[PDB]
Amino acid sequence: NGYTYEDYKNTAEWLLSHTKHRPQVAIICGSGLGGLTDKLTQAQIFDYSEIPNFPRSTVPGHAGRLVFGFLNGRACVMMQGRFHMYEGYPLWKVTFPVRVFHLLGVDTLVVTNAAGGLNPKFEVGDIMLIRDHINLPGFSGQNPLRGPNDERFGDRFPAMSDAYDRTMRQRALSTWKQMGEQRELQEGTYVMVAGPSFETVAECRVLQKLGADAVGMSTVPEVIVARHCGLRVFGFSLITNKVIMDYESLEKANDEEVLAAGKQAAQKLEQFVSILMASIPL
Amino acid sequence: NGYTYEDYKNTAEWLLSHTKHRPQVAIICGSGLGGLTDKLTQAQIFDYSEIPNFPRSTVPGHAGRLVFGFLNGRACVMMQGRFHMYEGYPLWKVTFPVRVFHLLGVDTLVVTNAAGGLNPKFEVGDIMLIRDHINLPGFSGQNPLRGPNDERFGDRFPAMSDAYDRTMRQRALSTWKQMGEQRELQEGTYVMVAGPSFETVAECRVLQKLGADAVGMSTVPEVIVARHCGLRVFGFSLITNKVIMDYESLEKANDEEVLAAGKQAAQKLEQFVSILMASIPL
Amino acid sequence: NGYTYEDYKNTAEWLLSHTKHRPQVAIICGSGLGGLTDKLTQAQIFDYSEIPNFPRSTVPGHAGRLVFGFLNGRACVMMQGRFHMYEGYPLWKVTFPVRVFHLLGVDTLVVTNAAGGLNPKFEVGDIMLIRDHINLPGFSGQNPLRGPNDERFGDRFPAMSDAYDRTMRQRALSTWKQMGEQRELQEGTYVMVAGPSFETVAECRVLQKLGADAVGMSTVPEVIVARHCGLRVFGFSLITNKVIMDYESLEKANDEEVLAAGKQAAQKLEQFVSILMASIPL
Numbered sequence: 102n103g104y105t106y107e108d109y110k111n112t113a114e115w116l117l118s119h120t121k122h123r124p125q126v127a128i129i130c131g132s133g134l135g136g137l138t139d140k141l142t143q144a145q146i147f148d149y150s151e152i153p154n155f156p157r158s159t160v161p162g163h164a165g166r167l168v169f170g171f172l173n174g175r176a177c178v179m180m181q182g183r184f185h186m187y188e189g190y191p192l193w194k195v196t197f198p199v200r201v202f203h204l205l206g207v208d209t210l211v212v213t214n215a216a217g218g219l220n221p222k223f224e225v226g227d228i229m230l231i232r233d234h235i236n237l238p239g240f241s242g243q244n245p246l247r248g249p250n251d252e253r254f255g256d257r258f259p260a261m262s263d264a265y266d267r268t269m270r271q272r273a274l275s276t277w278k279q280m281g282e283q284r285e286l287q288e289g290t291y292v293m294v295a296g297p298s299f300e301t302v303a304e305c306r307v308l309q310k311l312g313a314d315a316v317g318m319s320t321v322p323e324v325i326v327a328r329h330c331g332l333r334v335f336g337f338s339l340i341t342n343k344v345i346m347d348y349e350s351l352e353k354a355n356d357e358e359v360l361a362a363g364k365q366a367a368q369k370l371e372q373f374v375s376i377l378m379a380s381i382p383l
Numbered sequence: 384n385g386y387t388y389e390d391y392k393n394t395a396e397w398l399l400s401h402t403k404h405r406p407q408v409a410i411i412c413g414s415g416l417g418g419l420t421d422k423l424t425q426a427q428i429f430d431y432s433e434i435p436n437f438p439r440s441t442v443p444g445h446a447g448r449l450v451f452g453f454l455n456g457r458a459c460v461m462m463q464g465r466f467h468m469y470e471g472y473p474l475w476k477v478t479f480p481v482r483v484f485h486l487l488g489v490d491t492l493v494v495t496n497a498a499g500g501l502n503p504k505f506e507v508g509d510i511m512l513i514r515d516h517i518n519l520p521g522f523s524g525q526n527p528l529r530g531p532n533d534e535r536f537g538d539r540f541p542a543m544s545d546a547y548d549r550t551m552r553q554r555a556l557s558t559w560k561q562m563g564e565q566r567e568l569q570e571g572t573y574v575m576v577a578g579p580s581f582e583t584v585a586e587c588r589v590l591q592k593l594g595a596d597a598v599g600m601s602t603v604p605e606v607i608v609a610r611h612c613g614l615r616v617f618g619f620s621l622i623t624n625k626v627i628m629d630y631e632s633l634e635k636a637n638d639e640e641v642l643a644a645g646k647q648a649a650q651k652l653e654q655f656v657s658i659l660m661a662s663i664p665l
Numbered sequence: 666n667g668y669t670y671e672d673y674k675n676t677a678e679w680l681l682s683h684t685k686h687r688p689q690v691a692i693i694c695g696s697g698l699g700g701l702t703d704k705l706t707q708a709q710i711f712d713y714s715e716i717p718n719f720p721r722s723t724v725p726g727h728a729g730r731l732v733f734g735f736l737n738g739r740a741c742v743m744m745q746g747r748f749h750m751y752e753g754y755p756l757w758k759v760t761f762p763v764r765v766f767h768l769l770g771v772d773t774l775v776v777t778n779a780a781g782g783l784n785p786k787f788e789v790g791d792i793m794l795i796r797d798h799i800n801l802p803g804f805s806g807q808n809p810l811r812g813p814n815d816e817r818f819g820d821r822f823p824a825m826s827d828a829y830d831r832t833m834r835q836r837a838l839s840t841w842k843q844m845g846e847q848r849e850l851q852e853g854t855y856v857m858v859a860g861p862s863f864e865t866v867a868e869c870r871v872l873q874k875l876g877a878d879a880v881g882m883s884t885v886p887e888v889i890v891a892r893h894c895g896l897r898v899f900g901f902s903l904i905t906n907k908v909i910m911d912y913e914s915l916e917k918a919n920d921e922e923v924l925a926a927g928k929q930a931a932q933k934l935e936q937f938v939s940i941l942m943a944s945i946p947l
């Protein structure tokens with residue numbers, strides 16, 4: 102790990118003295134969900150590039166900012182553009198923000214992302230709550246906590262079986278009910294793979310057999326660091342496509358479809374998240 | 384990644400100006416298949432060591448060369464001796480050649496290798512066409528594309544479900560028919576594991592349950608980079624041994640058997656590949 | 666790998682000339698099993714920190730020593746405190762000792778550890794003999810042998826299907842019989858995951874489906890290097906807890922329970938190991 106405890110500290114204090122805002126909830130916007138930033142009131146923007154110690158967003162479009170503000174009553178801090186392992190970032194960089202949030206006083210982390218559907222029940226457009234995850238990179242050593250543990254953040258061997266707040270998932274199925282929507286709110290297990298290339302049919306079948314419902318290339322690391330911090334964690338995935346699971350189909354997963362689906366489900370997610378805010382304690 | 388775009392460029396241009404040859408098809412010879420180099424006509428040899436930016440073949444025998452020439456009508460470039468992850472090479476070195484070939488004008492990549500049989504149907508000597516692969520190293524981060532993407536080579540999120548040219552596999556089952564052989568031409572999924580040590584019984588059973596038919600320690604990376612380049616990809620494995628899947632057997636996988644099997648299936652593979660050449664478009 | 670052959674040599678010779686002891690059996694004490702060091706007679710202690718080239722035990726408690734002596738007749742060398750991948754150590758450091766032992770003249774390696782129970786048959790307190798292992802980190806590249814092979818230690822492609830000495834496991838089931846205990850001596854497959862965080866329910870289910878019986882974050886690397894050396898290998902796990910495999914349970918794996926269980930099974934393991942010593946040939 103390239104960061105010493107002071108680095109997280111100095112980044113937090115810098116932000117703390119450059120904004121009057123004091124967030125309680127940190128929200129990480131996945132692919133094609135960055136719109137959530139518009140609904141914040143008294144919004145103060147910070148380009149990642151100007152924040153001390155932040156991973157310099159190489160070239161995904163150079164768009165990477167930390168937006169502070171109020172979202173339906175709660176003091177939020179949003180990450181528009183997140184860091185992925187496939188871009189070359191070691192996991193201690195990918196999750197650097199999460200530890201900064203903790204030192205800012207945040208106690209809740211909402212993670213969202215796009216993901217391919219492994220469960221045949223799911224359909225494009227669907228929203229899947231994350232009940233659990235399978236951290237494939239983690240089994241091999243790519244775990245954000247690898248390296249000496251710092252007591253100031255958490256214990257050496259944190260547990261993950263209760264990573265996704267049982268309360269928030271219930272208060273979420275409620276919100277969806279109140280919202281009264283056609284499709285029911287899905288719920289399942291998210292499996293993380295490093296990417297960046299898409300899975301093959303044989304790989305899709307492996308992920309299904311392992312019991313995964315959706316597949317992505319992020320989230321799990323942030324969740325692990327969050328939990329190690331004591332943060333409350335809630336998250337969901339937007340099924341932007343159904344992974345090819347048979348050799349006959351002449352269809353291929355592509356970033357166009359993923360962003361396209363993110364486009365149509367845009368406001369649908371903004372509402373859900375915005376309303377869900379009120380359901381977060383304090 | 385230690386290579387900048389110019390490095391691939393300079394390596395290509397160097398070769399381009401040191402040989403009159405202009406290959407269309409690149410062939411990577413797996414273990415005990417290097418013989419394919421004899422059948423090239425107007426053969427021009429280059430030791431890896433003399434090619435700018437090529438991974439310096441540490442000590443597997445110091446035998447590593449790029450042979451250009453004509454193989455049954457087609458302008459070929461062959462790699463005699465390939466780089467493996469288990470030798471310590473990062474994947475961006477292992478696959479460095481593939482990107483060089485692309486800049487040389489190659490549009491087709493033929494990959495061959497030796498592999499242990501997971502499918503009980505298979506028998507030593509058998510040849511298995513690769514319909515698909517399971518990239519275990521890739522799930523954890525060991526993907527040759529990890530790092531910033533270069534638009535000049537391909538897209539950020541390339542798809543792999545159609546990696547193995549459906550046309551060539553058919554034109555290959557044909558060639559085998561024409562060849563009229565005892566054993567039928569096998570076809571299946573290749574799973575890559577890093578090695579270098581051989582799998583245990585419990586590991587063999589895992590790989591079988593995942594739906595793999597053959598197991599090796601290479602290929603997948605080159606295939607991924609090839610596809611990311613737009614190259615056409617065809618490949619097969621020579622089942623040199625049947626992996627131990629029960630605790631009673633007092634047999635052990637060994638490099639002697641693997642090379643021995645490669646020895647007997649020698650000319651059988653040279654024919655197949657040589658004839659298959661004519662089946663490649665242009 | 667940061668070590669050259671001379672480094673292993675110089676470390677061995679240093680020890681060889683600083684102790685009159687000449688061990689035959691090397692014993693690696695897992696979590697809460699370090700007590701085995703008390704039963705050695707003519708015990709000579711060496712702090713890791715004073716041994717040339719040894720990984721400097723960062724901050725797990727600064728307790729890391731190599732204890733030489735006699736254990737029930739045999740010349741032993743014990744490692745009290747072992748190196749884990751999750752602490753940040755590359756595998757060639759984690760397994761550095763094993764190669765040192767080989768050069769000291771050791772021909773047998775006994776590895777012990779604590780592990781969560783995946784097999785429902787098992788219960789806390791149980792002792793599971795290791796018949797086989799599933800090296801998940803190894804499938805992705807985290808294999809201690811990665812890098813150029815040194816003929817002086819072993820072959821390039823060592824086999825692992827016969828890693829756990831069939832003879833010693835039998836002579837062990839015997840010893841347990843003689844010992845006449847309530848619970849029968851368990852036996853099974855150990856799956857290694859990198860950690861340091863504990864598995865989720867979805868991950869537990871994956872590990873069960875793969876056929877694993879117990880789960881830990883160590884051992885496999887040392888075993889692989891041992892075997893590559895020609896060493897005889899025997900090992901077992903102390904089931905310190907049953908991994909959570911259903912979402913209803915409001916229980917969580919924790920280092921307190923693990924050490925607690927290690928505490929009660931303390932002397933039970935010391936006896937077993939001590940007596941087992943006589944069953945090791947010479």
Ligand SMILES: O=c1[nH]cnc2c(C[N@@H+]3C[C@H](CO)[C@@H](O)C3)c[nH]c12
Pocket residue numbers: 132185215216217218296299300316317318341342344354355356357359360540
């Ligand atoms: O089919 C899929 N496989 C793996 N990840 C994704 C995702 C998630 N994100 C989306 C994004 C690519 O379009 C990249 O960062 C991965 C959507 N669909 C799939």
Ligand SMILES: O=c1[nH]cnc2c(C[N@@H+]3C[C@H](CO)[C@@H](O)C3)c[nH]c12
Pocket residue numbers: 414467497498499500578581582598599600623624626636637638639641642822
């Ligand atoms: O049983 C097996 N397991 C994993 N790989 C192979 C291979 C393939 N190559 C062959 C070569 C070792 O003999 C090494 O580079 C791996 C043949 N048989 C097996």
Ligand SMILES: O=c1[nH]cnc2c(C[N@@H+]3C[C@H](CO)[C@@H](O)C3)c[nH]c12
Pocket residue numbers: 258696749779780781782860863864880881882905906908918919920921923924
């Ligand atoms: O449930 C489990 N999952 C993974 N490893 C262990 C272990 C083994 N060791 C024990 C130790 C943590 O308490 C750490 O180094 C892992 C015991 N229980 C479990």
